Curated annotation (Swiss-Prot):
Protein localization: Virion
The gene coding this protein: gag-pol
Residues of the full protein shown: 1 to 102 of 1603
Span of the signal peptide: none
The protein's name: Matrix protein p19
Organism annotation: Rous sarcoma virus subgroup C (strain Prague)
Length: 102
C-alpha cells in the first residue's frame, strides 16, 4: 500500500497541481476502501471498473455517517486518473516505466 500512495500522489501532483491531496489523506482513503471490502487489492482502484462503485460507496459514507474526508480526496484522485487516462497513450507510458526499471 506504500507504492500505491506514491503513484497516486505523483499522478495528483501532475494533474491537480496545488489543490492536490496529501499522502496521509490518500492513505486514509485507500485504507477505508480496503476495510469496507471495496478494494481487494489497492491496485484495483487504477481500473475504471471500480470508479462508480467507489464514488457510490463514498457518497453513502458522507450522507449516512456524515464523514466526507475520503470522498473529497477521491474527487481529486479520480479527476487526476481521468486526466491521465485521457492525455496519454496508456501502454507506451507503461513501456516507459518498465524500461527505466531495467
Amino acid at each position: 500500500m506504500e507504492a500505491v500512495i506514491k503513484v497516486i500522489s505523483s499522478a495528483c501532483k501532475t494533474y491537480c497541481g496545488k489543490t492536490s491531496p496529501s499522502k496521509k489523506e490518500i492513505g486514509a482513503m485507500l485504507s477505508l476502501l480496503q476495510k469496507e471490502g471495496l478494494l481487494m487489492s489497492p491496485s484495483d482502484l487504477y481500473s475504471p471498473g471500480s470508479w462508480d462503485p467507489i464514488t457510490a460507496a463514498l457518497s453513502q459514507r458522507a450522507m449516512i455517517l456524515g464523514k466526507s474526508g475520503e470522498l473529497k480526496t477521491w474527487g481529486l484522485v479520480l479527476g487526476a486518473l481521468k486526466a491521465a487516462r485521457e492525455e496519454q497513450v496508456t501502454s507506451e507510458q507503461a513501456k516507459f516505466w518498465l524500461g527505466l526499471g531495467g
